[model samples]
Target: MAYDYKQVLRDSLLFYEAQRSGRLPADQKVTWRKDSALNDQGDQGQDLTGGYFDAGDFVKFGFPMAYTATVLAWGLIDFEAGYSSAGALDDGRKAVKWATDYFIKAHTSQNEFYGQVGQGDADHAFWGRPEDMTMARPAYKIDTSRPGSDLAGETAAALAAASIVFRNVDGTYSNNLLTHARQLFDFANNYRGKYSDSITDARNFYASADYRDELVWAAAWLYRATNDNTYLNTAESLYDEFGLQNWGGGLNWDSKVSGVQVLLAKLTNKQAYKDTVQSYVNYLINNQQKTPKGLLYIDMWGTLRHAANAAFIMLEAAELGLSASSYRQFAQTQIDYALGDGGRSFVCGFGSNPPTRPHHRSSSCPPAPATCDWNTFNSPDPNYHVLSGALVGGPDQNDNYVDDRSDYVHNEVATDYNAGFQSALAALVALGY
Candidate 1:
């Protein structure tokens, strides 16, 4: 059976709403989630209450959140017809705005940006609703004295891409986003250092391997948004300087190698960039490890996320006219694997036997007036609220999966996990697949 790409696209946006971290909006679709984390402030007491809960935990990790925003905006910018036809364009844009608004606030100064809003271990220790959390959630940043090119660059890319997503819808807002994007790109370019090195706490959870790929990625998006030759020139120069073609990893929150190459190919239609993307996508389709059920098993952690990310990348490559049919077919199989092709759906509340115990906090608890703590976490029953559209950490290499709440590694639901998956769904919807 064919998957309902349109419904899944809408559900993915709903999943993002479920992950909101601050004050609930008037039109908030996820009514079960109430206002929480209202006191999240930077060290200087600047308001930092809004963004997203990183995963099953309550902490707001900036790196992956920004990456998620970029990918979501990329989908909106490239596949608007799908979102429009599916009646999800507004929610899709809302999803990106929620993060960009927080990012604009987080860019407190020209060279300063808050990289994280909660301590990892401290946040991880608690498993209750975000509204009921009483733990200390400290903020961390990187400045001139402590540089973080990766964080700044990724945030720049997100804003740049989002600017394009809103360009015609809101000119003033788009310009404001571009202004922030340009400033962030400059800051990242001038100061070169890993954000994890400065925001030391992030090292344990979301460490940076390198920052060069993000620099190029941000420049590419900036060029797309501004149509300025300077940004494109910088992207090309950095592409060579950083030796990004040699970066083997597929696109994700940490790695942007394939993403950068694919974007550059789209922008310039150059043979070198196209060839690079082709090799990468071919490798993913032909050589990558696959589960017995045909799911692309890239990593044990967020295994479905990896396949979805690859599918989105391949779809983008397909648009570049490189093995378009085959690339899209491979992409479809990967997406279908998440939708139910793997014997059961890996997405929450989406298909037959969809996950009922995703490792999420707020949804795991009953609505107010009831206690939701470790006891709730330990409960054998399913989550109290259905986290629709959430893509859980997937099955093992052998396609073995158990809907156990205690298994954080396999049951965890996160913002980044849904970004590419949602984008790929939009792409498939646009293609009428």
Candidate 2:
């Protein structure tokens, strides 16, 4: 049976609510979360609460987290009516605002934006709760001497995309988000360097090997936010001149080609953007490798994440006046599979025989300081509590999944994993849920 799309939409947003870092909100909705980690540095410590934990891990790397914020805001901006109809607009707004507020803090000065919150090596060693973290967890920032165009561009994209979301709700704050985004974009292009190059600690985890895609991504978003032809002109030139290859298969944290194409397609009726969209859409539906069951599986690990991203493009294509029926039908098929259409739900708690043990520290830990070790992780039973709404790393190409905490490749959850999936859910629900 098909899982409830409305319930899927609500649960997906609830995943974000569960991943909130730093301070916790005082609503019964998110009461399970408490005030956790890195709040002690005072004004100097960087008020680090509010953004989100990166994944099953404790780090808050900015590249993926910022991209997550951009996608979340895009859902509200493009599908506002849909969210309202599905009873999730309020929750959606709160999610975007929380990230924007944190980004504002991370973007401290004119040129600096602290991109990484916790240490990768140090944090990976401890397999316990976030509140108990006492490692260095040092903050890393980028300026002109050592610029991170990818991080700057993506973070800029987040603020610009979010600016559209708040234009009607809070005009002043909306303007503020745009102002910062413009400056950030300029810094990103002028001082061109990948984020991973500047922050060696994050190279293995959230590396941005190339900043070209990010520059294009930021320009496309800025154009949408300000309706400025300069941004549009810049994006057009960059798309052609940069020699970036065509987007295909799947879009992920490191990939921005599909994201820029979707943004441009929505903002204009120009056939150039449509050309990119149609070509990429064809590749996904026709050329991409798939499981026997029909998932566009790009990688063995976290294959569901890739499906979610592609599904979002299809949803955006439907909204952009493309082949609405075909695009939406494909998206619905892909997302439904993730929601148990493939005989089992990939999400932790939504459908029949869902995953019980997600590879997470905070969610799997028993109590405050009791400590959970390898014994707990290797246990045959389910996790102590529910990780509501998390989209786990999915099955292998053969459609096989194990509900085990040790399988990071197939059981872990991440912020970016749910970003597009949640937005896609919002899009589908608005159409009719």
Candidate 3:
């Protein structure tokens, strides 16, 4: 089955709506048996109760929201054709507004440290609370309360990009937002150590890989929006130092890390980065397995995952005019695998683990916890991982099928899946898919 890009776009828009409408809830939003310890709905869905420096999760969450809004804004203008009625524009604007407002608030409120109120102070700031020393500077005074060092950099990039895309609506960029974002980027780039700086963390849960990719990703977006040489130089230097060089031939290197590098290549026009991305794409192609249903399945992490990541990367390569047929084929294959039969909605991720009893571990990482091992069909369950925010057609990660009688929402997490979904959807809508 060939990929239906238009369907994917429509589904993504629907999924986004579900997330905002409170249908799709994460551990931070809804209370569930396993997430009871983590849920703090009264706290305005802030992850602060978890700790200060742990704010990197919020930053991580915010990135996909920003990416979603940016892509949706472009889609509204280019694909939706600038909204005919006031109602339509209102709907579109609301979606974009949710992203913009949330981005600003998250950065200002969550990413700050203890010492300075608004300013991200290294001493008082959230350093590494949510998880242990996943990155360097693991045992600073900030301890586990730290957000990623690259939080400011990625936030700045999101702000600058948002300003450019949304200038038409708001008239001008938000000064405070831009200012803080710039400060964060400055700290990460200059104070840290360019790309090689071990101190530049991004997310608390996944700091090492997150910092490297987020800095480069944010730098690329910032440069594209501002045409600033500093942003470009910083991005290029990071690309040289840590971008793909840090990959240890792990599954994440091919799936998540490689995807970011592809985006940077597109943004920077650096052949070396482009070549690196192509090499991974080649690997995905060579290893792809054809399902009995005629869909292409690739090994992502431990599962034979099929979701927005492959679609986004392949679409990006196509937009860049890459002439690799295998890449295109794999993209289509993954899309088809995600879609399944006509009666079913898109699943967030897929593997050979079987639809009746799919793998539900939040991450493919070992030492998997009991709570993280459930699956949901058609709608997401409370214990679903961050990536579950993308639509899925299974039970909760626990292998329990979705309750047919209950009303359920789809994909709710703010993560890379939605980022890829938004980008791929925008391109599909624009390309007449």
Candidate 4:
């Protein structure tokens, strides 16, 4: 079996275009996504208008969104050839900039940052085109009084990684990004707390497990972006300080231990970091739970996302010359599982028998002047538009999935879900697969 990872990589960038939240650009390819959430502002009326929506629902949970940006930028930074060969380099840069620009705006001050936009319950209650939304959108923040080291650190990681992506493209913009990244890192290090604790609305969804891993993650990224010894020293010390090597699990928006180990291994080429990542990937390939159809079933929610994240991490480890052939093979199998090996494609608008009824509000709605409401959501029809390139929440433990718009767990598409999947696709393309 074979797949065109370059085309899939191109399509994945298109999904980000479809998820744009505010002020559609003139060259916007996803024309179905119009300008929405224009009134998004911080607590002090600061502009907070342009970022990708978190998922099928409209809330902009900054933690995962920042993680998505960081991973996407990491792919672009490491796999520029893949993105260029696929003609996705410009779009990839745009996708990262879209989130980084919003993050810059969200950082209202040195010690203050808006971590979430729109209430989760309120946003989920309505299902229609984002353009047609009619509700009061509120913004939440974490400041000196209310600290969210996880959010701050993750955002710092995102900006630092993205600064590298934009370095040669736009030096001034890159410098500006690095400026904010340093400030956010200091803020995160100075004040220590979970983001959800500050922004209570985010607790029910996207809660942080801990902030220490993110602190290490951000420091490593800053070191990569700047080639600064101070950042690297901080990263190594934090790794031991937090006992990250003892942690177990695959990479995702929530967990960064494995990712930290891999990054450290790549940066330092240290035997210890390499050993940690090698063991982690080996466990995933040999011991982690798998669906009957051979999918890496790490978690019930976003099953494919977890697999792809593990695949991406393994691919990174492969790059370090650690069990290169086997790691690459394992990574390919995991990615191919989502592509079609699992019996049906989980990505929208790609491969045989792809998903049609993705649980996305805008794509589910018809064009304006046509009434699109809950009735449109209830009808047993595919999405009005092809939410192209989106990797939907995948099958159950038994690999059972239905193309139903109502099943958010199985059909919803999210920014975080695509981050690792897209990155792994880029990695495959870069390897000339």
Candidate 5:
């Protein structure tokens, strides 16, 4: 039976709405909604009202959020027909806007950018709703003194890409996003340092490898948005480092080489960019390791996220006229495994033998004032609320996935995990399954 790819795309967008952290609007359209979070940046007097939580946790990691927004915008720009036809265009715009709006607020000063809200340990220790989060959800920003090229670069790319997405829909707003993007690009390129160093807390969680990939990625997007030769030139210098080197990992929130490749593939007439981009795709299809059941496995912990991320690249490569038939089939196989082809759906509340308990706080607990502790994480029962449309961490090398709540490796839902996966799903829907 053919999967309802359009329905799957809609549901994936709905998943982002489900993970929202602010006061939901009446016209929200999403059945699953939540109350407001971090109404103010902890008495520091900054409104940090909107943005999606990083993972199964309440903290908002700006790095992943920006990456998510950028990827979401890419989906909109490339596959608007699918979204418009499926009645998800507005919601998709809203999804991207939620993060862009927060990011605009985060870039408070010309030289400073706030990148994170809420403490990881505190947020994790207390298991309750985001609305009832009692820990210190303070805002952390980087300035001249403490610089972060990676965070700034990725954020710049998000706004730049979003600028393109909103251009026809809202010209003035799009220009404003572009303005922010340019400023962020300057900050990121000029300031050379890892964000986790300044943010400190992010070190253990979403650590940095090098800021150059994001520097290149953001420059690529900025050039597309502005057609500024300087942005293009900057990206060219960075791409020079690519030396056609295949990073050979999942194209995801933490990584941006695939992003640089794809953006260049779409934007540049240079055969070099196209060749490098297609080479990465060929590597994923031919060289990358796959599980026995055909799921690509880069990181065993979040194998599904890796596969979904690669699937998104393949989908975009297909749209860019790289290799439509094979890339489409490859994307389908990975997404199918996530949907049910792995013998069970890795997405919660979606298919046969879906996960009953995910490693999330609000979904496990009924409401506020309820005691949520280790017992809740170790619960034998299904969640009190169904985290519908969430993609869980996937199976291991043996093609085994256990739906236990405590197993974060197999049952956690993350913002980064959904970003590219949702975009790829939209392209798949556009291609008629």
Candidate 6:
């Protein structure tokens, strides 16, 4: 049976609403708090943890923006066709607009990017200190440490994606955005020999995995949207650096890395790269454990983690013309296990527990202090929930637990997720997914 696009749209709306209501405001930007006691809203604080770390709002917003734009771009094209089209185009366009505006506004005036916006006082800075921002506007900041090569490379990937979307809609790419992209590529090319030949460090930035995939995807889009081979050539070079590796391990390297790799392989018909991606898929299928209800779980350090990484990988598989039915089935099963009825509360990492009932707390709950595992919460790490929700079908009520709290520092509701979510949703829609 064909997947339910209508249901996906409905779910996307629901999740988007929840995310819109839950984000913190911009003026309240501060260090992240551990519990929601610092949440600006009156709702019970869950975890108000602060820090300008990339994993928090920066990525959270970036992912959704990218996801929404992707969906919207697809949706627009699909709507132009006649396949049971509804308001997908309108919604997708709106999402893209929101994402772009948010991203631009989120840039710190000092050239640094904050990890989380409204969570703590200005004194608490995370990655991407002011100096890095001074160098050039990044697609997304890596950490407080400025001018890191890996972060620059990842930022280039992001700008590549953003530029594609901007060019598609506006018919002209922003100079600032394009400058960042070129800067990132130059940085990567210059530093390629300096890092481990594996491209591993470049793969760990906040925007690394998805950024790499998006770079290739953006190249394809740029070629289609603008008939530009320059973008394609750049993409081909970067793909060679990041897409053909056998970075095997758990979901961390396996599914995530392979997802990006599969995208590149599909775009460029490189059998060797395709073969490497397939190896990871086979490994995932072989290692996945089924629940009593027949749901699949990608084993990550013994945690029954959902197949988010696998979902992206499966999307690549479908793009590659591989028989992704099994992988998709597995992905849906995993989603059911995480968000379906009888599923446990979504947890970010193994040993972490999502709150049974939302209550104000001051510390990271289940994942421990060391790893926030932002995915555990119902919403995408406050930043990217909108985009993740669109891809995974929007947020559940439980996902909005952080919405009610008022004392939280960075957890207060904001526009970061909305911006990113819109962009990603637009792309997904445009892509006909």
Which candidate number maximizes lDDT?
A: 1
Steric clashes per prediction = 0, 0, 38, 0, 0, 90
lDDT, candidate 3, 1-433, per-residue tens = 4454554554444434434422223422212212111321222344322211111122223333344444454345433432322124445555555555544544434334211111223322332222221221221111123444444455555566555555566655545445555655655554442221222332232334345665666676667666788878887787678745456322221123554566567666878767776666666556555444444344322121334555656666665567545555556555544555422434443222212212222221122242211122223433233222244433232223332312222222333334445445555545544
- Displacement of residue 305 (Cα, Å) in model 5 is 1.0
After superposing all C-alphas onto the true structure, candidate 1 shows an RMSD in angstroms of 0.8
- Across 1-433, the per-residue lDDT of candidate 1 in tens digits comes to 6778999998998899999999989999999999999999987899998998888888899999999999999998889988998998888899999999999999999889998988988888887788888888899999999999999999999999999999999999999999999999999999999999999999999999999999999999999999999999999999998888888959999999999999999999899999899888888888889998899989999999999999999999999999999999999999999999889998898998999999888899998789888999989899999999999999999999999988888898899999999999999999997
C-alpha TM-score for every candidate: 0.99, 0.95, 0.58, 0.99, 0.95, 0.52
Q: Write the per-residue lDDT of candidate 4 for residues 178-288, one digit (tens) a residue.
A: 999999999999999999998999988999999999999999999999999999999999999899999875688888888899999889989999888888888888988
Number of the candidate with higher TM-score, 5 or 6: 5
User: Judged by lDDT against the true structure, how good is candidate 6?
Assistant: 0.37
> Candidate 5, clashing residue pairs?
none
Q: With candidate 3 superimposed using the best TM-score fit, by how many Å does residue 307's alpha carbon deviate from the native?
A: 3.5
Q: 4 or 5, which is superior by lDDT?
A: 4
Q: Which tens-of-lDDT digit does each residue in 63-97 have in candidate 5?
A: 98999999999889898887877788988898899
TM-score of candidate 4 to 2 decimals: 0.99
Off by over 4 Å in 4: none
Candidate 6: give its CA RMSD in angstroms. 11.5
Question: Model 6, 1-433: lDDT tens per residue?
Answer: 2334444444444333333312333522122322221221112222322212222222233332334434334334423331224354444444444443443433333233222223222212322222111121113232223433333333344454555545555645445555545544454444332121232222332223333444444454444443467866766676676643745522221123453466457556878767777777776667555444554444322122224445445544655767666755554444444443324323221112322222112122232333323233333233322222322211232222222222232132222222222222233343455
